[PDB]
């Protein structure tokens, strides 16, 4: 089949499966929940990596790599169902089983304890780009809920809570920046409830994205304040410089962002014609397509001219000069892959000193003169990035509203919206909301937003007063 | 202890353990054969990555990521003792065991078969930067023989053997370039014998390095011609464009280089004062050390002046302005870490418009005027990189000689040298050489060099004639 079959509003699952394969991003594997990242998908991850990696180095974070294997002893200092266990090498069984990391707290922090003698050893700010395994036996999805996934995990240890408190929001803003400025995805910054917070953590901050096709929200990336909980388990301690004899535990953060990003990018921006790449993230921003043997070679020459002219303005461009494929095949092919701009030039356009420039987001065919080629296209790329963010941003505002009763909350949820409600914060009430909304698949707490829409008031459960406005909704 | 205890010539094992820990490169882990890569070690890998990654993109290779998990079905298409097996997730056991990749041929090539319809789909040139597990139950060493290790693995598929034949040597030259131009390690390019070649491969080319302290050689990185062996196992086939009806198998290469690089860098260049970084690879090329409160702040100002002046010539520099450590502590500290140049400036030097510049390789203390600071230091950095390569290169020539009998071969081997001998290529003779040299730990074939010292003659075993001069020696 040439293009997509299922519409996004018709069958999101089929639509999603078709767009990720037809855009040459994903290939399926014979192990469930594991997917192959083809260059078109991996290039986006590299764009995210290059940005985020450069930004954390300004904050004084340094890259590293810890082992993928965790001892049982290390895991049970903290203490599971998602942890993959290696039990044999070849035919011979191991004396003791060894676990694949779902996260590296128990791997890294024993070494942190050895590196901390005094407060001058702090702060320690380390990051690693690696893979982790979480054997979640649900229905896995490419990018969004994968059994293996690439990510970064940062782990910081400080002398004071206040130092650690500032980094949490610094990192969370960098994640929002990755979602908003790179991927053009609007996000809601907030604190997780007690039920949804990171196990062993003091508090978890999160960025919540909204996938309007499902009417479901998704956790976009979290920054955790572990406090002194992990530094006690592994005895990360230093001499108190203010108090002669006493000993103080290190205040720790951990933070992580994954290849889920690419899945949210696909789900939000993608349309019924295929993938849609934000220019800031697209490895190919512009694709040049040629539209007598001498006249054919002249058409090739014009394309190589436009190619190198765009490279001189650092615009990531590629010329598709393969003569084995027709122009019509190329338009559709690069449509599916979601290249922001198709630079189209035919015999008549070449003669008239111009070319057709097709925007991927709108489908607008703009005729630009050869002299205004490199100034206009970057203006178009910027407008594509802005159009994508604005469209999605307003899509979020429209689908996020306030409700003060469980009755109004239910109907708003049924319309495919997420909604902020007066909430006490207690976990028994949170389970009741999931239970009641499922019977009337259940709605979960997404985050307690830093900037809520309205201000406080009885709780939705109607037993005790409300502590804060909390964002609820159906979720991935 | 302030510095190293064991001498390199005295106890290489203790020396190696002390230099990797005292230079803050390695930290030990509670799983045998697995080691923590601290920033100082990881930064070198990043330098190698940035170079190699940029170079293969010029050749038209694209990055990707395949799953770490391999099905049993996929492994036995090719067909083991080194393969780690996952058998349970949490408390519940998996229906079928799943293996951790020691290499990704069986993971990638089923997908390659699906992507190849016709010859226009070829060539496919893919690379991935990832971790792999080889549960080798020997005595593991940090960097050199690790149970988990970071690497890159490239996998290419072509229409013709000749295309694949050119890439093999292109990639091998890039590995030599990584060893010689980045790490300043001299290497011997050669073809592996039939015994040592990659299982399922047509032929393996290799770069052999020499660690003079042991008198042992080590495999530095290999580029393999898999031929049609793997494309038959997984049915990677396309329509023959020259022959109407017949069907042709894809000609494949695979190639890999690992964090072993850093181990060979440490073993070759390191001395009895600690690590020695080649300037091209050092994340800190120059370290500035300060040597009345107003006069102290003036000394700090001069250091920040030199710092930013070196950043303006893109020299990677850091100022160690920590007042909690003494100058003497800093000299030794950065000596152990092997920073090419210690830029030292004291009160008297500041007054005289000059500074002491200490080379790490030689220990030469050069006084450079403040005006000639940024032109001379880059000349010094270049001379350090050249001095390291030349010293090591001649170290190799001196320890690599020719022998024509088994008698002379034995004594030359006992002097701690590697030696090229007349060899037929057969595996029974190769085992006899390992057996005889062990009793008189055994010597193995290293490579059949492309540029041998001498030219052909009976074999060393003395049964049949010799086919080629082959490099033998004790090995890691
Ligand atoms: N199965 C998954 N597939 C893809 N991404 C996943 C999956 N599970 C969680 N994530 C994403 O990882 C992010 C970070 O995971 S996290 O559990 O919230 N945090 C940690 O593990 C911290 C960092 C080191 N310890 C989440 O925000 C979520 O978006
Ligand atoms: N245990 C090891 N630790 C560190 N490096 C190791 C270890 N075993 C092999 N190596 C290094 O990997 C290199 C590549 O490994 S290789 O076996 O020679 N080749 C492959 O696996 C090919 C690439 C994809 N399939 C070797 O040259 C060797 O120097
Ligand atoms: Zn309540
Ligand atoms: Zn022989």
mmCIF file of N, CA, C and O in Angstrom, chain A residues 119-176:
data_model
loop_
_atom_site.group_PDB
_atom_site.id
_atom_site.type_symbol
_atom_site.label_atom_id
_atom_site.label_comp_id
_atom_site.label_asym_id
_atom_site.label_seq_id
_atom_site.Cartn_x
_atom_site.Cartn_y
_atom_site.Cartn_z
ATOM 1 N N UNK A 119 32.253 17.318 52.969
ATOM 2 C CA UNK A 119 31.321 18.118 52.166
ATOM 3 C C UNK A 119 31.963 18.731 50.918
ATOM 4 O O UNK A 119 31.255 19.145 50.001
ATOM 5 N N UNK A 120 33.294 18.800 50.890
ATOM 6 C CA UNK A 120 34.022 19.272 49.703
ATOM 7 C C UNK A 120 33.928 18.289 48.531
ATOM 8 O O UNK A 120 34.095 18.683 47.375
ATOM 9 N N UNK A 121 33.668 17.016 48.834
ATOM 10 C CA UNK A 121 33.419 16.003 47.803
ATOM 11 C C UNK A 121 32.081 16.237 47.094
ATOM 12 O O UNK A 121 31.903 15.829 45.946
ATOM 13 N N UNK A 122 31.143 16.880 47.789
ATOM 14 C CA UNK A 122 29.860 17.263 47.206
ATOM 15 C C UNK A 122 29.962 18.670 46.610
ATOM 16 O O UNK A 122 30.751 19.485 47.088
ATOM 17 N N UNK A 123 29.160 18.967 45.572
ATOM 18 C CA UNK A 123 28.151 18.104 44.960
ATOM 19 C C UNK A 123 28.717 17.144 43.912
ATOM 20 O O UNK A 123 29.722 17.448 43.267
ATOM 21 N N UNK A 124 28.070 15.990 43.765
ATOM 22 C CA UNK A 124 28.380 15.039 42.702
ATOM 23 C C UNK A 124 27.195 15.006 41.745
ATOM 24 O O UNK A 124 26.098 14.604 42.129
ATOM 25 N N UNK A 125 27.429 15.430 40.505
ATOM 26 C CA UNK A 125 26.381 15.534 39.499
ATOM 27 C C UNK A 125 26.755 14.687 38.284
ATOM 28 O O UNK A 125 27.566 15.101 37.456
ATOM 29 N N UNK A 126 26.163 13.497 38.191
ATOM 30 C CA UNK A 126 26.493 12.533 37.140
ATOM 31 C C UNK A 126 25.276 12.161 36.300
ATOM 32 O O UNK A 126 24.157 12.089 36.806
ATOM 33 N N UNK A 127 25.524 11.913 35.016
ATOM 34 C CA UNK A 127 24.497 11.501 34.067
ATOM 35 C C UNK A 127 25.012 10.347 33.213
ATOM 36 O O UNK A 127 26.222 10.200 33.024
ATOM 37 N N UNK A 128 24.101 9.516 32.714
ATOM 38 C CA UNK A 128 24.470 8.489 31.743
ATOM 39 C C UNK A 128 23.369 8.284 30.704
ATOM 40 O O UNK A 128 22.185 8.313 31.033
ATOM 41 N N UNK A 129 23.779 8.104 29.450
ATOM 42 C CA UNK A 129 22.874 7.742 28.364
ATOM 43 C C UNK A 129 22.970 6.237 28.152
ATOM 44 O O UNK A 129 24.021 5.730 27.761
ATOM 45 N N UNK A 130 21.880 5.524 28.421
ATOM 46 C CA UNK A 130 21.911 4.063 28.414
ATOM 47 C C UNK A 130 20.533 3.441 28.217
ATOM 48 O O UNK A 130 19.529 4.147 28.080
ATOM 49 N N UNK A 131 20.501 2.112 28.196
ATOM 50 C CA UNK A 131 19.254 1.360 28.099
ATOM 51 C C UNK A 131 18.872 0.750 29.445
ATOM 52 O O UNK A 131 19.739 0.430 30.262
ATOM 53 N N UNK A 132 17.568 0.602 29.662
ATOM 54 C CA UNK A 132 17.027 -0.012 30.875
ATOM 55 C C UNK A 132 15.863 -0.921 30.513
ATOM 56 O O UNK A 132 15.215 -0.728 29.485
ATOM 57 N N UNK A 133 15.609 -1.914 31.360
ATOM 58 C CA UNK A 133 14.557 -2.893 31.115
ATOM 59 C C UNK A 133 13.516 -2.836 32.228
ATOM 60 O O UNK A 133 13.853 -2.871 33.411
ATOM 61 N N UNK A 134 12.251 -2.732 31.834
ATOM 62 C CA UNK A 134 11.135 -2.822 32.766
ATOM 63 C C UNK A 134 10.108 -3.768 32.169
ATOM 64 O O UNK A 134 9.347 -3.390 31.279
ATOM 65 N N UNK A 135 10.103 -5.008 32.654
ATOM 66 C CA UNK A 135 9.264 -6.057 32.082
ATOM 67 C C UNK A 135 7.810 -5.903 32.529
ATOM 68 O O UNK A 135 7.292 -6.707 33.303
ATOM 69 N N UNK A 136 7.163 -4.858 32.018
ATOM 70 C CA UNK A 136 5.772 -4.553 32.336
ATOM 71 C C UNK A 136 4.870 -5.413 31.453
ATOM 72 O O UNK A 136 4.872 -5.262 30.230
ATOM 73 N N UNK A 137 4.099 -6.306 32.073
ATOM 74 C CA UNK A 137 3.292 -7.283 31.333
ATOM 75 C C UNK A 137 1.903 -6.758 30.949
ATOM 76 O O UNK A 137 0.912 -7.487 31.042
ATOM 77 N N UNK A 138 1.839 -5.502 30.509
ATOM 78 C CA UNK A 138 0.606 -4.917 29.984
ATOM 79 C C UNK A 138 0.602 -5.132 28.463
ATOM 80 O O UNK A 138 1.223 -6.078 27.973
ATOM 81 N N UNK A 139 -0.110 -4.281 27.728
ATOM 82 C CA UNK A 139 0.007 -4.221 26.276
ATOM 83 C C UNK A 139 1.017 -3.123 25.937
ATOM 84 O O UNK A 139 0.690 -1.937 26.034
ATOM 85 N N UNK A 140 2.252 -3.506 25.550
ATOM 86 C CA UNK A 140 3.250 -2.474 25.278
ATOM 87 C C UNK A 140 2.967 -1.725 23.982
ATOM 88 O O UNK A 140 2.323 -2.267 23.083
ATOM 89 N N UNK A 141 3.442 -0.485 23.903
ATOM 90 C CA UNK A 141 3.314 0.323 22.697
ATOM 91 C C UNK A 141 4.695 0.818 22.275
ATOM 92 O O UNK A 141 5.528 1.124 23.129
ATOM 93 N N UNK A 142 4.950 0.888 20.956
ATOM 94 C CA UNK A 142 6.190 1.500 20.482
ATOM 95 C C UNK A 142 6.386 2.900 21.060
ATOM 96 O O UNK A 142 5.428 3.674 21.130
ATOM 97 N N UNK A 143 7.613 3.195 21.489
ATOM 98 C CA UNK A 143 7.978 4.466 22.134
ATOM 99 C C UNK A 143 7.342 4.703 23.514
ATOM 100 O O UNK A 143 8.058 4.914 24.491
ATOM 101 N N UNK A 144 6.011 4.662 23.590
ATOM 102 C CA UNK A 144 5.277 5.089 24.795
ATOM 103 C C UNK A 144 5.479 4.163 25.997
ATOM 104 O O UNK A 144 5.862 4.618 27.077
ATOM 105 N N UNK A 145 5.200 2.876 25.804
ATOM 106 C CA UNK A 145 5.386 1.854 26.837
ATOM 107 C C UNK A 145 6.166 0.683 26.254
ATOM 108 O O UNK A 145 5.578 -0.301 25.802
ATOM 109 N N UNK A 146 7.490 0.796 26.260
ATOM 110 C CA UNK A 146 8.353 -0.252 25.725
ATOM 111 C C UNK A 146 9.046 -1.015 26.848
ATOM 112 O O UNK A 146 9.249 -0.489 27.945
ATOM 113 N N UNK A 147 9.411 -2.259 26.551
ATOM 114 C CA UNK A 147 9.950 -3.179 27.545
ATOM 115 C C UNK A 147 11.438 -2.906 27.772
ATOM 116 O O UNK A 147 11.933 -3.007 28.894
ATOM 117 N N UNK A 148 12.143 -2.586 26.688
ATOM 118 C CA UNK A 148 13.449 -1.942 26.757
ATOM 119 C C UNK A 148 13.282 -0.534 26.203
ATOM 120 O O UNK A 148 12.471 -0.311 25.300
ATOM 121 N N UNK A 149 14.040 0.414 26.742
ATOM 122 C CA UNK A 149 14.055 1.765 26.191
ATOM 123 C C UNK A 149 15.352 2.503 26.486
ATOM 124 O O UNK A 149 15.964 2.318 27.537
ATOM 125 N N UNK A 150 15.768 3.324 25.527
ATOM 126 C CA UNK A 150 16.893 4.226 25.708
ATOM 127 C C UNK A 150 16.430 5.424 26.520
ATOM 128 O O UNK A 150 15.287 5.862 26.392
ATOM 129 N N UNK A 151 17.316 5.945 27.362
ATOM 130 C CA UNK A 151 17.019 7.148 28.127
ATOM 131 C C UNK A 151 18.297 7.831 28.583
ATOM 132 O O UNK A 151 19.399 7.406 28.233
ATOM 133 N N UNK A 152 18.131 8.904 29.346
ATOM 134 C CA UNK A 152 19.196 9.417 30.191
ATOM 135 C C UNK A 152 18.693 9.376 31.619
ATOM 136 O O UNK A 152 17.502 9.563 31.865
ATOM 137 N N UNK A 153 19.596 9.097 32.553
ATOM 138 C CA UNK A 153 19.282 9.206 33.967
ATOM 139 C C UNK A 153 20.364 10.013 34.665
ATOM 140 O O UNK A 153 21.533 9.631 34.665
ATOM 141 N N UNK A 154 19.970 11.150 35.226
ATOM 142 C CA UNK A 154 20.869 11.976 36.013
ATOM 143 C C UNK A 154 20.686 11.666 37.481
ATOM 144 O O UNK A 154 19.575 11.363 37.920
ATOM 145 N N UNK A 155 21.782 11.720 38.231
ATOM 146 C CA UNK A 155 21.774 11.436 39.662
ATOM 147 C C UNK A 155 22.698 12.421 40.369
ATOM 148 O O UNK A 155 23.910 12.412 40.139
ATOM 149 N N UNK A 156 22.126 13.268 41.221
ATOM 150 C CA UNK A 156 22.889 14.306 41.900
ATOM 151 C C UNK A 156 22.796 14.169 43.417
ATOM 152 O O UNK A 156 21.770 13.746 43.946
ATOM 153 N N UNK A 157 23.881 14.529 44.101
ATOM 154 C CA UNK A 157 23.947 14.493 45.562
ATOM 155 C C UNK A 157 24.521 15.811 46.081
ATOM 156 O O UNK A 157 25.570 16.253 45.621
ATOM 157 N N UNK A 158 23.830 16.429 47.037
ATOM 158 C CA UNK A 158 24.211 17.746 47.552
ATOM 159 C C UNK A 158 24.361 17.747 49.068
ATOM 160 O O UNK A 158 23.937 16.812 49.749
ATOM 161 N N UNK A 159 24.961 18.815 49.584
ATOM 162 C CA UNK A 159 25.125 18.999 51.021
ATOM 163 C C UNK A 159 23.825 19.471 51.676
ATOM 164 O O UNK A 159 23.506 19.055 52.793
ATOM 165 N N UNK A 160 23.084 20.336 50.979
ATOM 166 C CA UNK A 160 21.851 20.921 51.508
ATOM 167 C C UNK A 160 20.641 20.599 50.636
ATOM 168 O O UNK A 160 20.770 20.392 49.430
ATOM 169 N N UNK A 161 19.465 20.579 51.262
ATOM 170 C CA UNK A 161 18.201 20.330 50.566
ATOM 171 C C UNK A 161 17.909 21.416 49.529
ATOM 172 O O UNK A 161 17.362 21.132 48.463
ATOM 173 N N UNK A 162 18.279 22.652 49.852
ATOM 174 C CA UNK A 162 17.965 23.803 49.012
ATOM 175 C C UNK A 162 18.687 23.747 47.664
ATOM 176 O O UNK A 162 18.105 24.090 46.635
ATOM 177 N N UNK A 163 19.945 23.312 47.674
ATOM 178 C CA UNK A 163 20.684 23.043 46.434
ATOM 179 C C UNK A 163 19.952 22.020 45.571
ATOM 180 O O UNK A 163 19.783 22.218 44.367
ATOM 181 N N UNK A 164 19.535 20.924 46.198
ATOM 182 C CA UNK A 164 18.814 19.861 45.503
ATOM 183 C C UNK A 164 17.438 20.327 45.025
ATOM 184 O O UNK A 164 16.951 19.866 43.994
ATOM 185 N N UNK A 165 16.821 21.238 45.776
ATOM 186 C CA UNK A 165 15.501 21.768 45.432
ATOM 187 C C UNK A 165 15.534 22.619 44.164
ATOM 188 O O UNK A 165 14.590 22.598 43.377
ATOM 189 N N UNK A 166 16.617 23.364 43.969
ATOM 190 C CA UNK A 166 16.760 24.212 42.786
ATOM 191 C C UNK A 166 17.015 23.384 41.522
ATOM 192 O O UNK A 166 16.458 23.682 40.466
ATOM 193 N N UNK A 167 17.844 22.347 41.634
ATOM 194 C CA UNK A 167 18.156 21.492 40.485
ATOM 195 C C UNK A 167 16.911 20.786 39.945
ATOM 196 O O UNK A 167 16.739 20.678 38.733
ATOM 197 N N UNK A 168 16.055 20.308 40.846
ATOM 198 C CA UNK A 168 14.822 19.614 40.455
ATOM 199 C C UNK A 168 14.038 20.424 39.422
ATOM 200 O O UNK A 168 13.631 19.889 38.389
ATOM 201 N N UNK A 169 13.844 21.711 39.706
ATOM 202 C CA UNK A 169 13.088 22.599 38.823
ATOM 203 C C UNK A 169 13.905 23.028 37.606
ATOM 204 O O UNK A 169 13.344 23.273 36.537
ATOM 205 N N UNK A 170 15.221 23.134 37.773
ATOM 206 C CA UNK A 170 16.113 23.410 36.646
ATOM 207 C C UNK A 170 15.994 22.305 35.601
ATOM 208 O O UNK A 170 15.779 22.578 34.418
ATOM 209 N N UNK A 171 16.116 21.060 36.054
ATOM 210 C CA UNK A 171 16.018 19.898 35.175
ATOM 211 C C UNK A 171 14.621 19.762 34.567
ATOM 212 O O UNK A 171 14.490 19.465 33.382
ATOM 213 N N UNK A 172 13.586 19.977 35.376
ATOM 214 C CA UNK A 172 12.210 19.882 34.891
ATOM 215 C C UNK A 172 11.934 20.907 33.795
ATOM 216 O O UNK A 172 11.227 20.619 32.833
ATOM 217 N N UNK A 173 12.496 22.103 33.947
ATOM 218 C CA UNK A 173 12.385 23.126 32.916
ATOM 219 C C UNK A 173 13.102 22.707 31.629
ATOM 220 O O UNK A 173 12.623 22.996 30.530
ATOM 221 N N UNK A 174 14.242 22.030 31.766
ATOM 222 C CA UNK A 174 14.965 21.507 30.602
ATOM 223 C C UNK A 174 14.150 20.447 29.863
ATOM 224 O O UNK A 174 14.199 20.378 28.635
ATOM 225 N N UNK A 175 13.406 19.627 30.605
ATOM 226 C CA UNK A 175 12.500 18.652 29.992
ATOM 227 C C UNK A 175 11.346 19.343 29.272
ATOM 228 O O UNK A 175 10.992 18.963 28.157
ATOM 229 N N UNK A 176 10.758 20.348 29.916
ATOM 230 C CA UNK A 176 9.712 21.157 29.291
ATOM 231 C C UNK A 176 10.250 21.822 28.030
ATOM 232 O O UNK A 176 9.571 21.870 27.005
#
